[PDB]
Amino acid sequence: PWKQPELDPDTPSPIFGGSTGGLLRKAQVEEFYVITWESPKEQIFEMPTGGAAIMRKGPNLLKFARKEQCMALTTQLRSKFRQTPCFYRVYADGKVQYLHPKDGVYPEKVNAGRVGVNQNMRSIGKNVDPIKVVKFTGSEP
Amino acid sequence: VKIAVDRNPVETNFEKWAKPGHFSRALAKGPNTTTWIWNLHADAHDFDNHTSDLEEISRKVFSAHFGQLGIILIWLSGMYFHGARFSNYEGWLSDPTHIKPSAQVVWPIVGQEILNGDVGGGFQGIQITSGFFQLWRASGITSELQLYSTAIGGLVLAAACFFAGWFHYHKAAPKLEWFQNVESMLNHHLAGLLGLGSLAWAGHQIHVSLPVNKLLDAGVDPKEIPLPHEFLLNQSIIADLYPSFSKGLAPFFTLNWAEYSDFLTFKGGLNPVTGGLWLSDTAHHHLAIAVLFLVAGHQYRTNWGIGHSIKDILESHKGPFTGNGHAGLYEILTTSWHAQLAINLALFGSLSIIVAHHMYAMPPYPYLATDYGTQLSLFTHHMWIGGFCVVGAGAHAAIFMVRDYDPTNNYNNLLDRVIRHRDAIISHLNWVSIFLGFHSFGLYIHNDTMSALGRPQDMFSDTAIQLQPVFAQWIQNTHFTAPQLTAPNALAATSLTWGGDVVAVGGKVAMMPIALGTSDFLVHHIHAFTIHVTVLILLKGVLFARSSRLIPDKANLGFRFPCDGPGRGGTCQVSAWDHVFLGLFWMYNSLSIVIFHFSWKMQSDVWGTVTDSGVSHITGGNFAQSANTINGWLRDFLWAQSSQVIQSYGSALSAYGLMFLGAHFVWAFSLMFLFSGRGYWQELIESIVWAHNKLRVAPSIQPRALSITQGRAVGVAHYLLGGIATTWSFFLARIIAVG
Amino acid sequence: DIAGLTPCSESKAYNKLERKELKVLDKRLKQYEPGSAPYLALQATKERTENRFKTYAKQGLLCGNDGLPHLISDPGLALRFNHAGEVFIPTFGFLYVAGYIGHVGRQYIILSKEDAKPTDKEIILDVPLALKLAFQGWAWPLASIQELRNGSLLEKDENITVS
Amino acid sequence: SLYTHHQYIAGFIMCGAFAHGAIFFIRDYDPEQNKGNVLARVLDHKEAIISHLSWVSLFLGFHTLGLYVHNDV
Amino acid sequence: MFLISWRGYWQELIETLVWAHEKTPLANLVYWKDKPVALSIVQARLVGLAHFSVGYIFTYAAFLIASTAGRFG
Amino acid sequence: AHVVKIYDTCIGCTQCVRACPLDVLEMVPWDGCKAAQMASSPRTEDCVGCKRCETACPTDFLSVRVYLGNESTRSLGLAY
Amino acid sequence: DFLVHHAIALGLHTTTLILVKGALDARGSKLMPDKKDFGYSFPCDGPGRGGTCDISAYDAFYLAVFWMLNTIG
Amino acid sequence: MKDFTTYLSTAPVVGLGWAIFTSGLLIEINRFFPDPLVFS
């Protein structure tokens, strides 16, 4: 984006009684993920882990243990309610990382700033046999 | 409330018969692979996927159900017809004990006439085990002419049912409003169908079946019986049998009902002659049942401002621990068919299981308990039907969670709160299955190991470390000593299984008290192990259908999908469909032992020929000693009782010897589909397509291996068919050749 | 004779098996009355059984020590010792029928593929065409060698390969 | 026991020859070096080998089972 | 089991036992060194084939020796 | 720790990018195609191996391949 | 003795089919033109292309052992 | 009627007519000419 939005760790959360699909001991020790978005009204939405919850008008914040749990929610909000979520990654040390709209534009739209990675300039197939690379790793690279 | 119908919605013509796949958008294009063929027959009756309109889904359902009735009624009329023209009913009616039934005589081409065994009665044919002959005798049926007319009625009514399905879909189909009038259904279907239907049968019982079976049990010849219409017209005839008829409905309207004690009774027990329930007791049963359903049908609100409303009932039973409870369910059940189908199949399958228990101990029809093949075939049948129906609830409930679940309606509801502690359900239920499989099945291995080591004193058995079912034993005596204290007007007990004396008919025992011991403790606890596990597989699939930790978005993938991918270490058989595919294997392992329990127990402890000195059971009472060991089930049940099947070559039971083998082939044949995968087969077809291509003889419809979910379905189908058909041959050949 | 096998006429166990299988019916026939239909059914089975045994003996079959007829497969021994109808001749009776099915299905496939929408012609057959080919296939061996000698039977490296 | 012991081993061993023969085609096979030789000419027309094999399995399977089932009945 | 029932049913089940081991009051103090996960796909085909073949062999060895030894002929 | 390589036959459909839940794939400009787009795989550390990307590529043979390899906590999809 | 020696032939010819196929089609198939890049043993290539379960040459050896045991039985 | 004849030309309906022919032919050839094994 213009600039990465820093994390506001104190924002209101949705109205959700709780469930058993929440966070486990891995979260405090290794890492966990949090997602933010801004809603115009009070609505109901399905959580990835558990049941239904009620959003809040204004900013909202959740905490998840997996990136798929977060991106599963973005696909729901972008489609059903047509919003623009953004989620981070929090380590146990307190470090924070801004992941998904890393360029500000979603990945399915091009942008001039991006640089290609893992781009082979050949056709699928048309690559050396494993015997040529028998004693080190990799036939595709 | 009112009637609502839409006229001529659909034109009737064979235009779409020529265009298969019209119902689906994808299939209407046409086939370019052979996978289009399998998807056609599969998605044919999934009306929810064809269209989003709930109205059209309702029209299709209400009219297809008319088809199953017509399909049933020609089947039912076939039994009456085949029993009239190709049977020995008139001969069996005069000597029921010695003559065996038969209604499937065979034509004389290659071999195949030896199957027409020497049944008896100047007749030779296949021996049936469906219990129609005892049913037709429980009602007044002495001649074949009554069966012909009954068959012609079914074809007439069946065509009407087929005609209605066309009429109530193609010509004059109801609206969605007519279907959502739920309170009128229960009012009509309780009072009208169950109420008057039971009252009417009592009319047939009172006016026809009682006198006819009174004369037949008194030795009178069937041809000399007065025809059932004579009892209606002549008040004098039936009065000779039951003098209460002479008063003529004055006792009823004056509320002096004791005068009808002649034919409305509370005897209990069994008839000493027929080994079946007193026909007078059943007329009293179905009569009281009608009055009970009639008042039940006047409960709801339909139109006249009196009665209950289901919505106000549901949203008024609330609690603290539950929060918002039972609120949003009236909107669910009035909107999704799958929710109702889940509830109904569960209680329509658990009912056939109740039928299986409550018939064998309480034989309602005459001369059924002495036909051991019939009594064993009805138990095995109506139990398997219960297992399939119950498993359908787990499948047809997961479809609701995936397709017809809207989280907006369910917030802090019962359904929402169940999902929010699902990990507690499956976790606590996992511990029980492990606790039971150890303490139940481990006891069998302990007895096997102790016996092989020469330590029979340390086994679990009657002469040993006895584990006796004290609670059931106390309930047997309580129901046995009930006529004295808790039911004074009852002349005897409900059944002799609780306690009493033997009832012998034709030199064979109909029913005698069943004793429970150490072996019956282990088996009754083995059943709970298979049941709590079968629930774990289905209930896990339901709750984790919509989302899980491994796959937070399953609902977008759908109800049936093979896998998300090899990632996450592997995601094969994660859908709710694949949970049903696993639960069927456990339903099979459950009821297969409920059935072995019924066969060995009743052969050893109950059935047998009564002599002057007691009873000589079929297997000499070996259930107590041998059953504690698994080798006993292998030796004394399988190796022993398979002698009648294996030695069936050269006799009328030869068909069972072949089905016994063919059932094994189809079972093992399933293993190719379960163990293997689509990948190996699609490559093999390519090398085959080369040869078919080399000779310019190749199909334009490309050959494709079966889908993943289909290979799993094809497996469990050929698996269950071979596993079930083996018992069907092992049992009927064993029991028809008695002992 | 050959292979140490006796003819079925001279065998004792063969006649022993006949006397056994008839004794089962005679015992079963005692139960019913003379003029009843079960009696007529069993008498017919008796008549068929007596006919099955004499016809197999008349046909020069070979019965072993067990008393059951055995078949011979080599055309040399079959023709030398007059046992050709057993295996050798039915081999040509099948292959005429089997090639009939191939020559017919091969022609329906080729001809429908020369038109538009051949996929529909497989699920919805052209029955007039199928009957036409089915009654034109009496001389399929002629057409095969005609098509082989011509070279229009096989395709030539216009087929998909995998590497 | 001596017969079954060796024959069951003969099957396990022989299933390894093909398995360890398949690993050769993946890891230790060079097509350009082995060009035009017998080993490449086999791999070229493999659709014929796998097909003519499937005929023999199907042929023995139908006709052998059909006779046992013809005799069972 | 390993042949018919495949991984996805089980990994969701092990996730449920993991929840219980952490929420239990006293057992939560104990913690694994290596995380528990279900068996892989290829591993199960191997494991289930071993449980398959061993019963195929131990069953016949008993029958072969017992049938022949008891009769002594 | 899986490997994702995209090949020269990409046509800029973006169906691979829309399908991946974990945001491994993104679109980058390129001069080889009509659409003037190409995919990329900058962050394969978050890859999981669902092979939904391969399922969506409409080419004759795939312009995207997931070569499975060494596992990890993120790759095994472990919430714990 | 005739029928069994032919039924034994069913085993050897079809067991060879399963193992020969897994060898020759080890390098590539139309469903998976490059098996050689993955390896001898991998689970599958995914649910795409109609399904790719049990394609690898390891899965051919896996299925042959069932026939090895049946044949030797 | 054009659509009815087309429905009768589908695969399973034509297969049903085939099955009755081949099966009835073999049976009646075993009803008469009972128990053939050797062909004269």
Ligand code: CLA
């Ligand atoms: C001859 C009269 C007639 C005609 C011309 C039509 C014509 C039509 N109907 Mg209609 N219908 C009729 C009678 C008729 N119907 C009757 C009597 C009923 C009541 C059951 C219905 C109920 C009905 C419904 C509920 C629906 C239609 C639909 C349709 C349309 C699609 C037809 C189709 O797919 O063919 C199908 C062709 C068949 C030959 C089907 C045969 C099915 C039989 C009953 C199964 C037999 C069971 C078998 C013997 C059991 C053994 C199997 C074993 C494995 C157990 C078409 C306009 C559909 C529609 O509106 O189109 C979207 C639709 O949803 N009809």
Ligand code: CLA
């Ligand atoms: C008893 C079980 C059983 C049976 C019968 C088969 C049968 C077969 N397997 Mg198989 N398989 C099994 C278990 C079984 N397998 C198991 C447990 C595994 C381990 C996963 C495998 C693994 C396996 C592999 C890996 C391969 C096979 C192959 C084959 C085929 C070999 C060719 C042959 O002889 O066909 C002819 C033999 C038959 C017995 C034909 C069966 C049909 C008969 C005639 C009945 C006909 C139907 C009848 C008309 C009634 C139908 C009515 C109904 C539709 C209502 C054949 C279809 C190979 C193959 O397909 O190559 C061609 C192959 O590559 N199988």
Ligand code: CLA
């Ligand atoms: C007293 C009135 C009455 C009676 C007797 C019935 C009886 C029945 N209803 Mg029902 N129903 C009623 C009122 C009634 N309904 C009302 C008021 C509504 C709207 C609120 C509905 C809406 C309804 C639906 C939506 C469905 C049924 C179905 C059924 C059948 C269930 C099949 C069964 O259990 O096997 C018992 C079977 C029999 C006893 C066989 C008898 C069959 C004959 C033909 C029925 C005769 C009774 C008939 C309803 C009388 C009026 C018909 C007349 C106008 C021509 C059963 C025949 C199901 C169905 O149609 O399945 C086919 C179904 O899906 N009902």
Ligand code: CLA
């Ligand atoms: C009142 C009973 C009832 C009704 C109305 C339905 C209705 C439906 N079910 Mg359901 N189901 C039921 C009971 C019922 N089910 C039970 C008891 C079970 C547990 C076994 C299931 C398990 C089940 C599953 C697992 C699935 C369904 C699905 C479906 C839908 C698609 C129907 C379909 O594909 O069939 C069209 C017809 C066929 C496919 C033909 C069936 C052929 C069977 C398998 C063979 C029968 C063999 C025969 C009896 C014996 C062998 C002899 C042979 C030689 C002839 C439809 C809404 C599917 C779906 O997508 O739901 C949305 C699905 O995935 N159901």
Ligand code: CLA
């Ligand atoms: C005989 C074969 C067999 C056996 C023993 C099992 C055993 C089990 N299955 Mg199972 N299963 C099988 C076949 C079998 N399956 C097949 C063929 C299928 C395919 C349909 C399935 C599908 C299936 C599903 C879908 C599920 C199971 C589940 C279970 C478990 C239930 C918990 C329990 O009671 O365990 C208690 C222990 C026993 C029953 C073991 C009995 C033997 C004794 C007690 C062990 C003795 C140990 C000994 C003393 C120690 C020796 C140590 C030594 C090293 C010195 C259990 C581990 C369920 C599960 O795991 O979740 C709870 C479940 O959900 N199975």
Ligand code: CLA
């Ligand atoms: C009434 C219930 C019913 C039943 C039981 C079936 C059963 C079948 N249909 Mg089907 N179908 C139905 C209703 C039904 N359909 C309806 C209502 C429609 C809409 C009009 C269709 C439209 C339809 C199409 C368009 C096609 C089928 C096909 C098939 C067959 C699958 C192909 C196969 O496995 O053979 C594979 C066969 C071979 C590889 C070689 C040919 C040898 C065959 C087996 C001989 C002929 C079998 C014969 C039809 C059996 C008698 C009928 C039987 C049900 C009693 C299968 C027999 C397909 C087919 O080709 O049928 C044969 C097919 O293309 N069906």
Ligand SMILES: CCCCCCCCCCCCCCCC(=O)OC[C@H](COP(=O)(O)OC[C@@H](O)CO)OC(=O)CCCCCCCCCCCCCCC
């Ligand atoms: C068949 C025997 C099985 C018994 C053992 C099974 C134990 C497993 C269940 C544990 C779940 C506990 C959490 C409850 C869930 C809970 O918190 O819900 C709260 C609920 C009370 O609800 P409220 O009154 O708050 O609200 C009810 C309203 O919401 C109405 O919808 O508690 C109960 O109903 C107690 C149920 C005891 C359940 C145990 C008995 C179940 C079998 C019934 C027969 C028992 C007597 C048998 C002797 C003859």
Ligand SMILES: CC1=C(C/C=C(\C)CCC[C@H](C)CCC[C@H](C)CCCC(C)C)C(=O)c2ccccc2C1=O
């Ligand atoms: C065998 C098998 C196949 C191949 C099976 C196929 C292609 C089905 C074959 C269906 C045939 C065509 C039905 C017809 C069979 C007979 C011809 C019917 C007899 C007809 C005669 C009487 C004329 C799979 O595709 C598969 C996929 C996934 C897991 C396991 C498996 C699997 O085990």
Ligand SMILES: CC1=C(C/C=C(\C)CCC[C@H](C)CCC[C@H](C)CCCC(C)C)C(=O)c2ccccc2C1=O
């Ligand atoms: C039960 C089951 C599991 C779960 C099974 C587990 C976790 C059991 C393995 C752990 C236990 C504790 C080992 C039991 C000890 C063994 C009896 C002895 C092992 C001896 C080795 C050390 C040599 C799977 O992961 C699986 C995966 C794919 C297909 C099918 C299945 C499957 O069926």
